[PDB]
Structure formats: structure tokens, C-alpha cells
RNA sequence: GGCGACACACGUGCUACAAUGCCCACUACAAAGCGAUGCCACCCGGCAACGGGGAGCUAAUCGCAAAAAGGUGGGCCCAGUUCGGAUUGGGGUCUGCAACCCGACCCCAUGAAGCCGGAAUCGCUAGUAAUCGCGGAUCAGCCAUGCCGCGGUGAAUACG
RNA sequence: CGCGGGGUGGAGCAGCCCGGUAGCUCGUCGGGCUCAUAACCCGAAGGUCGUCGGUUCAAAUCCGGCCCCCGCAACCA
RNA sequence: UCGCCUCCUAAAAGGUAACGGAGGCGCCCAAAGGUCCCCUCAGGCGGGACGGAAAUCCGCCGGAGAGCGCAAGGGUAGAAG
């Protein structure tokens, strides 16, 4: 069933299918699994709506996920920009923001290559 | 069935709060809620008119009415579009059936919207009716989520006999419409 | 990251802590870009050195945990050809 | 793999210890 | 409403994050809703759980004591 | 402050794209080096980095030390995935007068490109090539995937 | 003046006829092979279709004006 | 250039010339025909997911500027659309 906005995990395995939520994976999963006293080894296909609603209630209440989570990391960076801050500039120009020589491949952050003449 | 909770809730505590607030002399002058028109601009399905009967089937399911199929008005080249072809489905509800849907929408659909910090306060059209767009259709209860092949939204038009938005907002708030203030 | 810490240089720390309790506020040129900023810094106009000159940087409440050289960048760019 | 710092194999490679490679013998 | 080619629309029972709605009156009776943002969680009867605006708020606290 | 720049181009590399593989628990087997301005067992606090305490050793006499692969056992079921961990957000530890520019590391979230790489091109003939860990120099710390070394398991194939 | 043809990536041709998609050779750029250059190999970038106006859903393509280009003709006097 | 159609020249009936000014035809439609019933445009402002000057949807204003297979003219929503 569906948690945190919509975000339906299905089948698979319950501690794994928990990763598929925004803001959650590994730790934050195997934690709320016993905290709600639920077997992690089970499969989200079948389980009592009991262990289902106990499970959404925890998670959706505990921490912020999905929309509001992304909205927070947004305004966090918006904050780094427009405060004229260094890291802000590296966000403003879409260049690597920590350490990181840019003379050669930044590519993940820089985009694919745009070649020019010698 | 002529009962329909929210319908009741309109006469039996929305109307009075309205007369009290705007000071209406005549029984009619106090705003009535008529005709919510759901319309899928579906031009997504353009060449495939097969996709459409799935989408029309789904509207019926969440309305109680099969929608009219709109057709293209003028032929326009920039995106495909022969003059004849179907653009989308468009369905009119009123009178009970509008309420029984408008109830379900208010208590179920809009809740199920990802995020949702509330309905836009500026969408009133100035002669005091209200339009609002939706993106995915699985936020309705009648949808099983395994019956969606693709995701088609709709524009929703709510027409009211209020002569201004100030009055139209009030009617709609008091009915329980979650405005973003 | 320090914590038992929050290193600020004592040189400007003086002239700032003064400009509260002296009552008066104005433009103060410092070389110390290693230092952290605020609380009694906010609203002061501090000139930070980039290696070349002193850059005016206005101060506000979300500049808080940020070192003084964040706001004085060291390299001139404007892109390529 | 040897670059997942969140794994056993990774930690060993970077040479470090933690929740994924706690030091016990 | 023309007879034939139509969803049934029969009185129903519907549940959710908190209670029911005896109202129902829908096609496909007895349906299961995820959460009504109004059980008054989620922004209505404003909960404002796990609130924002801590980032200008925190950097001032661990900051000048140490 | 810069040598750490970033529209770009090349050389040497590392981690991979997974099921002869990934993760978790348990169980084994090395060599060569280093350290009483240091190496720190063992105990406690901490998810952890680390911090408190604190015994031994001028060291075949104490410490770095867990070797890793392997072994057993269970999990994953071919999925851009329990593959892969780049990027970024927040939280911290440490060295150091000082980590904005530029440190290493820990946790939480984020999880990108990548499904064996055009033309072309490198190394290796045996305890070698592949693959797996380990130590030292420099050194406060460290950008070491480097360099110099040590052992573990261990192919293929040479008509000519 | 007259009649015919043309004007499109940097160069030279196609596409217009029959509306909807611009192509081919060279050149240019990045890589490769070479001690090195050329030759050669693997990749890419590049045109708004002379111009204005018109028709159509839509114009390089059909129509009209003008601006160039080449060819032809200008006889009895 | 040569037959046909529309406008002007044409001097407010008709007709009216020039190697006067401008454009079209040599088709098309089995629905684009007959009839009965119903419906009314273009455009402008506001509102509405993907929808952008423009796809579709909802409000108001809009006597015809739209449409009438193709050129122009006359005509036409009290319909010819
Ligand atoms: Mg770095
Ligand atoms: Mg750098
Ligand atoms: Mg409004
Ligand atoms: Mg109204
Ligand atoms: Mg992994
Ligand atoms: Mg260098
Ligand atoms: Mg080179
Ligand atoms: Mg390397
Ligand atoms: Mg891919
Ligand atoms: Mg730095
Ligand atoms: Mg695969
Ligand atoms: Mg390769
Ligand atoms: Mg040999
Ligand atoms: Mg090493
Ligand atoms: Mg030509
Ligand atoms: Mg070349
Ligand atoms: Mg050459
Ligand atoms: Mg022309
Ligand atoms: Mg045109
Ligand atoms: Mg074209
Ligand atoms: Mg003669
Ligand atoms: Mg006359
Ligand atoms: Mg006359
Ligand atoms: Mg003619
Ligand atoms: Mg008929
Ligand atoms: Mg209109
Ligand atoms: Mg509009
Ligand atoms: Mg007309
Ligand atoms: Mg006409
Ligand atoms: Mg007319």
C-alpha cells in the first residue's frame, strides 16, 4: 500500500520496499521495522492492514519526506545562493561545491562535454 | 438518492451563515451552487482514439456519468491536429450527482494529493466562479491504481450563482474548501 | 567543524564588540577570513581581503555560522572566450 | 563494492572503521 | 440520465485514515482511502508537525557558548 | 591570496556496470615492516568517527593486528536492482594558531553516469598474468586510487 | 524594355515539378594512426532557403512585387 | 493575347472601348444532395493540469467583422452557417 504522499511500494520485501520512499533507506527502514514490531523479512504484498497503518503512521509522522523534504533542501540552497555565499555561487553556476578540481572531469555536476577548438 | 450529506450541510448551516454574513434580503439572492463541469483536455490521445474509451470509462467511474467527447474546432498544424479529431472528454454534473461527487472530492481526493498546502485563493474568475486543475486521476477513491496505464489530469469548473468572488469564496469556504488563504 | 571551538580572531573581535558598547558603527577592514561571524557582527560593515583588496560585505542573520571568507571570493572568472 | 563506505568491503578498503565495520575480535 | 451505458451509483460505505463517511453514495461501493488530509492531520486543523524554519534558528544556539 | 582556476584536449590510474555476484552473521590460514617526542591492549560513554580512563613494551618478550579472498550459514532473484556509490542537503569527530578558498574521517538523507566501451591501443611465458589484503618511507593532519615493498589463492597459451 | 533560367550550411550541386521530412561531395571541429605532416580511419558541428507581401491547417516548395545572377533576343531602317 | 466567371473603368436603369487597373474557371460533393427536428458565430477580457499567440473546459461582453468546398461580388444567424 501507499505511504508519504502516494509512493506505493509493492511485492519484493518490506525492509527493501521501504527504501523506495523519499527520505528513507537502509537505517531509517530497519529501525521503524522493529519499532513498529513488524517482521522486516515479510513481503509488502501481504500483511495485516494493522501492521500497515501502524507503519505509515510512524513514518509519515516521525520525519519529513517527499514534498516537504525536497521543499526544505530547495530553500536551504536558495539560502546559500542570494546570500552571496561562496557555496551559493558554486550552486549558481552549477559547478562542484566541495574541494574537487574542475580542470578535469566534474562531469556529473557539469553536464556532458561541450567540445571546442585547440 | 436525494439525501447526500454535503447537500444537507449546505442548507442546514451554509446558507444561514451566508445570509448572516452578506445580509441577503431575498431567498434566491443567497448563492446557489450549480453545475460543476469536469473536463479532460486529452489531446494526448489524438491519433489513438482507442486510448480515449479507457479515459472516458474512468471519468464515469468517479462521476456516475459517461462524459461527452469533445472534438477539434479548428485544424492546427503546430501540434498535429486535423480539424475533426477528438481532443478530450468533457462531463457536466449537477443536482445531487454533482454533490455526491463534490463530497467525495472534498473529503478524499484533494487529501490524497502529494504535498497539498491547499487550493489556490486567486483562481476565482472575477464574476465569481472557480476553476482548478488536477494532474493525476488516481487520487480519487474509485480508481484502483492498477487500472491506470497513463496519467491524465483534468480542469474542474465550478459555477455559482454568486455575483462576485467575495461571495463565491465564502460559499465555498463554508462548504469546506481547503484554501491556501 | 570544531565544537569547543568556534574560532574567531581576537583582532576584529575587539573592534566589533566595541561598536556595540561604544554605541557607534562603521567600516572595518580585516584580513581575517578564517574567523566565524555574528552575533554582534550582524549589521556591521566589514571589509574582507581576497588577497588583492578589501571587499565590503554587509552582515545579516543567516550569514551566522559562515566564515568571513565565504563572502569574499578569491578568484576572478566571467567564463571563457 | 570497495567504494561503498556504507559497507564492510568498502570500509576495509578506505582503511576505516564504523557502524558498518565495528572493531571487535 | 439515459438508461444504459452508465456506472451504477448505489449507496455505499467508505473508510479512511480515521473514520467513515456514511455519506458515500458512489459507484463501486465499499472503498478504502489512504488518508483524508482532513481527519485534521496534514495541514488541516493545522498540525504543522515536524516544523520548518530551524536553519537560521539553529546556527545561533550551538554557536557562541561552546 | 595563488600553485586547488574550468568552454575544453591528452597520458597514468581507481571504483564499477553484477548471480563464477552483492549484503549480513559466524569460522579459519600469511609475510615483511613500524612504534616507550610513539605504538596503545583491556574497561567504560558513544550507532560511529572519536573521547574518557588506563596496564605492557628501550620491544622474537608488549602494541599496530582485523589480514582479505577463502570457509560455513542464511538473505537478494536478473531488476538501473540489496548492482554501482558520483553528486548534493543536514548532523558531527580530529589534527592544527587556523580547515571559506583547499583537509581527512563518521553518521543521516540523496542516490547520478554506467547493462563491457568507435577507430585505435597496453601488460604479461609460472608461482608469471589475473585477483585479495598487509606494512613502510614522506608525515601535525592529508586529498595515497600514488610510490616502494610482503605474502595469500592462483590460470591460459607458444604451431611457428 | 522584352522572353527564359537561377538565388539553399564556408565552396560546388540536389531538394522546388508532386506542400508536411532539407540531402550529397568538399571543407571546418574533436579524436586516432605517424618521430612528424600529408594520405587514411572513427566521431561531430554547421543552413532558414535573396527579400517583402499573399494563399493554406501548414510554404525551401504555390502566387505577386521588388533586389541581384547568368543566358537569349533587339529585325525591315 | 484569343472562350467562361468576379470587381473597377461605366458618367446612381440596361448597355458601353483601349496591347486600361486587378484577380479567378476548364473542377468538386453519395454527402458538400431532399426533408423534419435542434443548434448559433468571429473576436476581446477573466478563470483552468500537462495547453504554449494559439487543442479542450467555465464565466461574462460580442449584430455579425465568422461560416457558407475554390476567385470576387452580392447575399445570409428571423440562415444560406
Ligand atoms: Mg577532494
Ligand atoms: Mg579545486
Ligand atoms: Mg481572481
Ligand atoms: Mg457566477
Ligand atoms: Mg552496494
Ligand atoms: Mg600541482
Ligand atoms: Mg598530454
Ligand atoms: Mg589513481
Ligand atoms: Mg542509462
Ligand atoms: Mg579550501
Ligand atoms: Mg543487468
Ligand atoms: Mg575501457
Ligand atoms: Mg620473458
Ligand atoms: Mg596501504
Ligand atoms: Mg542552382
Ligand atoms: Mg582533424
Ligand atoms: Mg595526419
Ligand atoms: Mg519571391
Ligand atoms: Mg505562411
Ligand atoms: Mg519545410
Ligand atoms: Mg529580314
Ligand atoms: Mg450602369
Ligand atoms: Mg448612366
Ligand atoms: Mg488567366
Ligand atoms: Mg440530413
Ligand atoms: Mg470565443
Ligand atoms: Mg485564457
Ligand atoms: Mg461575410
Ligand atoms: Mg466568396
Ligand atoms: Mg458579404
Q: Which domains does chain C have, with CATH numbers?
A: 6-81 (3.30.860.10)
Residue found under cell 451554509: B14
Judge contact between E44 and E37, C-beta under 8 A.
yes
Q: Are B83 and B72 in contact (CB under 8 A)?
A: yes
CA–CA distance, B67 with B65 (Å, rounded to integer):
6
Residue E36 in grid coordinates: 483524508
Using a CB–CB cutoff of 8 Å, tell me whether E32 touches chain C.
no
Which nucleotide is nearest, taking the CA of residue B129 and each C1'? Answer: H59
CA-based nearest residue to E27, from B106, B63, B38, B90? B63
Contacts of residue B75, Cβ cutoff 8 Å, sequence gap at least 6:
B81, B82, B83
Q: Write down the H helix ranges in chain B.
A: 5-11, 15-22, 50-63, 97-104, 165-174
User: What domain range is B109 assigned to?
Assistant: 2-181
Other CB atoms within 10 Å distance of the CB of residue D11: 19
Residue E33 and residue B109 in contact, taking contact as beta carbons nearer than 8 Å:
no
Method: X-ray
Cα B67 to averaged position of ligand 30 atoms, centre (Å): 39
Contact C71 A89 (CB under 8 A): no
Chains C and D touch (3+ CB pairs under 8 A): no
Give CA–CA dist B123/C56, Å, rounded: 45
Q: Using the Cα atoms of residue A37, residue A41, residue A42 and residue A45 in order, give the sign of their dihedral.
A: positive
Q: What ligand is nearest to the CA atom of residue D13?
A: 14
Q: Does C62 touch chain A (CB under 8 A)?
A: yes
Domain count, chain B: 1
| CA atoms of C46 and C60, how far apart (whole Å) | 12
Q: Is the CB of B132 under 7 A from strand H?
A: yes
Radius of gyration of chain B measured on its C-alpha atoms? 18
Euclidean distance between CA atoms C61 and C53, whole angstroms: 25
Instruction: Note which residues in 61-100 of chain A have CB less than 8 A from chain C.
Output: 79, 83-87, 89
Please report, in angstroms and rounded to a whole number, the separation of the first and last CA atoms in chain E: 75
3-state helix vs strand vs coil in chain B, percent to 5? 30, 15, 55
Nearest in space to B87 (alpha carbons), one of B95, B76, B103? B76
Q: What is the DSSP letter of B68?
A: E
Which cell numbers hold the place of B181? 488563504
Asked if the Cβ of residue A61 lies within 7 A of any atom of strand G, the reply is: no
Length of chain A: 118
Give the three-state DSSP class for B180.
coil
Q: What CATH number does the domain containing B15 carry?
A: 3.30.1440.10
Which of B115, B140, B148 is the mutation pick for testing A, counting most A CBs within 10 A?
A: B115
Residue E16 is labelled as binding a ligand: yes
Centre a 10 Å sphere on the Cβ of residue E10 and count the other Cβ atoms it contains.
13
d(Cα B155, Cα B98) in Å, to the nearest integer? 15
For residues B59 and B14, the answer to whether their CB atoms sit within 8 Å is no
DSSP string, A61-102: HHS--HHHHHHHHHHHHHHHTTTT-HHHHHHHTT---SS---
Resolution of the structure, angstroms: 3.0
Buried b (16+ CB within 10 A) or exposed e, C44-62: bebebbeeeebeebebeeb
Chains that touch B (3 or more CB pairs under 8 A): A, E
Cis check: omega of the bond before B153, within 30 degrees of 0: no
Amino acid at each position: 500500500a501507499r505511504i508519504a504522499g502516494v509512493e506505493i511500494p509493492r511485492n519484493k520485501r518490506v525492509d527493501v520496499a521501504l527504501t523506495y520512499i523519499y527520505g528513507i533507506g537502509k537505517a531509517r527502514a530497519k529501525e521503524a521495522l522493529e519499532k513498529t514490531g513488524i517482521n522486516p523479512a515479510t513481503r509488502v504484498k501481504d500483511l495485516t492492514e494493522a501492521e500497515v497503518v501502524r507503519l505509515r503512521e510512524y513514518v509519515e509522522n516521525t520525519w519529513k519526506l517527499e514534498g516537504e523534504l525536497r521543499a526544505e533542501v530547495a530553500a536551504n540552497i536558495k539560502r546559500l545562493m542570494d546570500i552571496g555565499c561562496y557555496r551559493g555561487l558554486r550552486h549558481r553556476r552549477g559547478l562542484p561545491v566541495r574541494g574537487q578540481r574542475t580542470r578535469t572531469n566534474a562531469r556529473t555536476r557539469k553536464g556532458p562535454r561541450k567540445t571546442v577548438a585547440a | 438518492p436525494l439525501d447526500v450529506a454535503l447537500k444537507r450541510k449546505y442548507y442546514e448551516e451554509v446558507r444561514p451563515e451566508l445570509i448572516r454574513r452578506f445580509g441577503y434580503q431575498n431567498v434566491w439572492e443567497v448563492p446557489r451552487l450549480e453545475k460543476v463541469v469536469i473536463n479532460q483536455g486529452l489531446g494526448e490521445a489524438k491519433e489513438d482514439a482507442r486510448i480515449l474509451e479507457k479515459a472516458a470509462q474512468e471519468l464515469a467511474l468517479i462521476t456516475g456519468q459517461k462524459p461527452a467527447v469533445t472534438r477539434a474546432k479548428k485544424s492546427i498544424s503546430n501540434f498535429k491536429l486535423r480539424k475533426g479529431m477528438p481532443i478530450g472528454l468533457r462531463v457536466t454534473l449537477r443536482r445531487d450527482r454533482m454533490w455526491i461527487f463534490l463530497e467525495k472530492l472534498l473529503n478524499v481526493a484533494l487529501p490524497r494529493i502529494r504535498d497539498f498546502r491547499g487550493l489556490n485563493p486567486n483562481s476565482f474568475d472575477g464574476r465569481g466562479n472557480y476553476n482548478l486543475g488536477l494532474r493525476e486521476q488516481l487520487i480519487f477513491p474509485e480508481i484502483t491504481y492498477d487500472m491506470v496505464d497513463a496519467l491524465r489530469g483534468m480542469d474542474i469548473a465550478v459555477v455559482t450563482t454568486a455575483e462576485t468572488d467575495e461571495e463565491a469564496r465564502a460559499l465555498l469556504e463554508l462548504l469546506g474548501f481547503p484554501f491556501r488563504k | 567543524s570544531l565544537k569547543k571551538g568556534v574560532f574567531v580572531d581576537d583582532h576584529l573581535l575587539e573592534k566589533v564588540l566595541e561598536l556595540n558598547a561604544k554605541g557607534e558603527k562603521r567600516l572595518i577592514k580585516t584580513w581575517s577570513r578564517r574567523s566565524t561571524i555574528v552575533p554582534e557582527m550582524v549589521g556591521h560593515t566589514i571589509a574582507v581581503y581576497n588577497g588583492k583588496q578589501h571587499v565590503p560585505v554587509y552582515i545579516t542573520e543567516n550569514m551566522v555560522g559562515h566564515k568571513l571568507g565565504e563572502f569574499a571570493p578569491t578568484r576572478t572568472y566571467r567564463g571563457h572566450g | 563494492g570497495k567504494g561503498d563506505r556504507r559497507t564492510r568491503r568498502g570500509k576495509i578498503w578506505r582503511g576505516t572503521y564504523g557502524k558498518y565495520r565495528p572493531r571487535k575480535k | 440520465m439515459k438508461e444504459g451505458i452508465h456506472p451504477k451509483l448505489v449507496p455505499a460505505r467508505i473508510i479512511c485514515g480515521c473514520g467513515n463517511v456514511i455519506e458515500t453514495y458512489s459507484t463501486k461501493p465499499e472503498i478504502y482511502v489512504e488518508v483524508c488530509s482532513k481527519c485534521h492531520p496534514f495541514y488541516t486543523g493545522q498540525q504543522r508537525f515536524v516544523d520548518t524554519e530551524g536553519r537560521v534558528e539553529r546556527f545561533q544556539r550551538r554557536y557562541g557558548d561552546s
